[PDB]
């Protein structure tokens, strides 16, 4: 039997599924550590590796990219879990090696590959404390090109009144996503700051792991693909909406939680986002 | 204890030793500072970011 992880229900993805929208024909690049394409609960449509010593993007030697991918798009069938956008065209854009790290130029080359390959959505469950002009230029170019770009806010927690959102989430063109649990409480590790845009579930998130496994992970890495997946649902229902419109639809329909420094606009609600008229619940 | 700001500017070797005294079961990974990394939160892990001289270049923390 398939299970629906609590986070997929929490953002109201099943309302879109019941309307008949599952992310079909929407291309989502998981820019990450690769995706294990042999997992029976995933279907990987293509991809490319920018990691010079790990040239197969369909081999995930870390496990992280495969978990993220399952939250985006685990298949709708009778096994495993169900992704937010289970019909999405999933692309493994491997820019992180086994140890979970990548050079800036690797990430940038993956963002470039996603633009050149007409990806509709990028998920980047990744980050660091410093930016670069060239990283900023890559994400800005992807957005200018029409791509919805979503990233983890970071797991730096709080630091008095300072922003702790990392890059690339900290860039204005990228949607930065923080993590809540099943009661909508901010996870203690979740980064904070005026750059925090929206929240999604990122505590004890069950998803696919390499070698035909499943497991519960924690992080703003787990929150970000709920939002990438949501963008794919919205696009499958409104294939002409621009990235601009998809981003505002998600921002404008959140369930407001606490102060925006800690929670941004609140929890995404993809049911409300995918209506024509938007308001917060 | 989940952050070690006093280790910034120390050798990677001394950092590992200190962190393992405070958290003997820690899963330590050493990475280059100025790289981008996955944003899962692993309560058992400490990532140490080193500069090109193998000294700690970022406050180590759990995650
Ligand atoms: Ca499934
Ligand atoms: Na941002």
CATH number where A224 lies: 3.40.50.200
Method of structure determination: X-ray
Into how many domains does chain A fold?
Answer: 1
Catalytic, out of A221, A224, A236, A249:
A221
Q: Find all residues with CB under 8 Å of A258, minimum gap 6, and list them.
A: A186
Distances (CA, A) of A94 to A47, A77, A210: 8, 26, 15
The rounded distance, in Å, linking the Cα atoms of A219 and A212 is 22
The rounded distance, in Å, linking the Cα atoms of A107 and A91 is 15
Measured in degrees and rounded to the nearest 5, phi and psi for residue A249 equal: -65, -40
The rounded distance, in Å, linking the Cα atoms of B7 and A281 is 45
Closest CA to A229 of A112, A122, A97, A119: A122
Closest CA to A43 of A56, A61, A30, A62: A30
Chain B CB contacts of A166 under 8 Å are 39
Task: For residue A33, give the nearest of B35, B38, B63 by CB distance.
Answer: B38
The rounded distance, in Å, linking the Cα atoms of A121 and B33 is 28
Which residue in chain B has the smallest CA separation from A132?
B34
Residue B28 CA to ligand 1 center (angstroms) comes to 34
Closest CA to A81 of A10, A16, A3, A13: A3
The rounded distance, in Å, linking the Cα atoms of A153 and A42 is 25
The rounded distance, in Å, linking the Cα atoms of B8 and A136 is 27
Cβ(A19)–Cβ(A113) below 8 Å:
no
| Residue A58 lies in domain | 1-281
Q: Is A276 a catalytic residue?
A: no
Quoted resolution (Å): 1.8
Cβ(A72)–Cβ(A232) below 8 Å:
yes
Six token digits for residue B30: 């050493």
The rounded distance, in Å, linking the Cα atoms of B18 and B11 is 11
Residue B46 per-residue DSSP state: E
Six token digits for residue A156: 């730096």
Q: CB distance B34–A33 less than 8 Å?
A: no
Closest CA to A181 of A250, A251, A257, A125: A257
Which residue in chain B has the smallest CA separation from A165?
B39
Residue A83 CA to ligand 1 center (angstroms) comes to 7
Six token digits for residue A14: 């099943």
Q: At what angle do helices A243-251 and A220-237 cross, to 10 degrees?
A: 120
Distances (CA, A) of B12 to A198, A203, B6: 36, 31, 13
Q: CB distance A152–B32 less than 8 Å?
A: no
| Pairing between β-strand B27-32 and β-strand A198-201 as defined by DSSP bridges | unpaired
* Alpha carbon of B17: minimum distance to chain A alpha carbons (Å): 21
Q: Is A101 a catalytic residue?
A: no
Cβ(A109)–Cβ(A95) below 8 Å:
yes
Grouping H, G, I as helix, E, B as strand and the rest as coil, residue B44 is coil
The rounded distance, in Å, linking the Cα atoms of A52 and B38 is 18
CB atoms within 10 A of CB A160: 6
Q: Cis bond leading into A168, ω under 30°?
A: yes
* Alpha carbon of B29: minimum distance to chain A alpha carbons (Å): 8
Chain B CB contacts of A70 under 8 Å are none
Closest CA to A47 of A142, A105, A117: A117
Q: What is the 3-state secondary structure (H, E, C) of chain A?
A: CCCCCHHHHHCCHHHHHHHCCCCCCCEEEEEECCCCCCCCCCCEEEEEECCCCCCCCCCCCCCHHHHHHHHHHCCCCCCCCCCCCCCCEEEEEECCCCCCEECHHHHHHHHHHHHHCCCCEEEECEEECCCCHHHHHHHHHHHHCCCEEEEECCCCCCECCECCCCECCCCCCCEEEEEECCCCCECCCCCCCCCCCEEEECCCEEEEECCCEEEEECEHHHHHHHHHHHHHHHHHHCCCCCHHHHHHHHHCCCECCCCHHHHCCCECCHHHHCCCCCCCC
Q: Sheet of A126-127: strands edge to edge?
A: A101-102, B36-38, A126-127
Architecture of domain B1-63: 2-Layer Sandwich (3.30)
Q: Does B53 touch chain A (CB under 8 A)?
A: no
Six token digits for residue A30: 């998981």
The rounded distance, in Å, linking the Cα atoms of B40 and B7 is 23
Closest CA to A196 of A216, A231, A170, A158: A170
Q: CB distance A127–B63 less than 8 Å?
A: no
């Amino acid at each position: 039997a398939q299970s629906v992880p609590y986070g997929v229900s929490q953002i109201k993805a099943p309302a879109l599924h019941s309307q008949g929208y599952t992310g079909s024909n929407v291309k989502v690049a998981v820019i990450d550590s690769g995706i294990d394409s042999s997992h029976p609960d995933l279907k990987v449509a293509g991809g490319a590796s920018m990691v010079p010593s790990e040239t197969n993007p369909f081999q995930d030697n870390n496990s992280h990219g495969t978990h993220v991918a399952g939250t985006v798009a685990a298949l709708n069938n009778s096994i495993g879990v169900l992704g937010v956008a289970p019909s999405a065209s999933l692309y493994a854009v491997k820019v992180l090696g086994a140890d979970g790290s990548g050079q800036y130029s690797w990430i940038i080359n993956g963002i470039e590959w996603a633009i050149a390959n007409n990806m509709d959505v990028i998920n980047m469950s990744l980050g660091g404390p410093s930016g670069s002009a060239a990283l900023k230029a890559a994400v800005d170019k992807a957005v200018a090109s029409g791509v919805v770009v979503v990233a983890a806010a970071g797991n730096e927690g709080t630091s008095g009144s300072s922003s702790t959102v990392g890059y690339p989430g900290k860039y204005p063109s990228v949607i930065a996503v923080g993590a809540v649990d099943s009661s909508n409480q901010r996870a203690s590790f979740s980064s904070v700051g005026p750059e925090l845009d929206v929240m999604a579930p990122g505590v004890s998130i069950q998803s696919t792991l390499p070698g035909n496994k499943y497991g519960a992970y924690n992080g703003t890495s787990m929150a970000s693909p709920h939002v990438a997946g949501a963008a794919a649902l919205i696009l499958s229902k409104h294939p002409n909406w621009t990235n601009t419109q998809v981003r505002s639809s998600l921002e404008n329909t959140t369930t407001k939680l606490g102060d925006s420094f800690y929670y941004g606009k609140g929890l995404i609600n993809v049911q409300a986002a995918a209506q024509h008229h938007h308001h917060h619940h | 204890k989940t952050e070690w700001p006093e280790l910034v500017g120390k050798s990677v070797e001394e950092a590992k030793k200190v962190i393992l005294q405070d958290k003997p079961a820690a899963q330590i990974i050493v990475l280059p500072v100025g790289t981008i990394v996955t944003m899962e939160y692993r309560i058992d892990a400490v990532r140490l970011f080193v500069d090109r001289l193998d000294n700690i270049a970022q406050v180590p923390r759990v995650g």
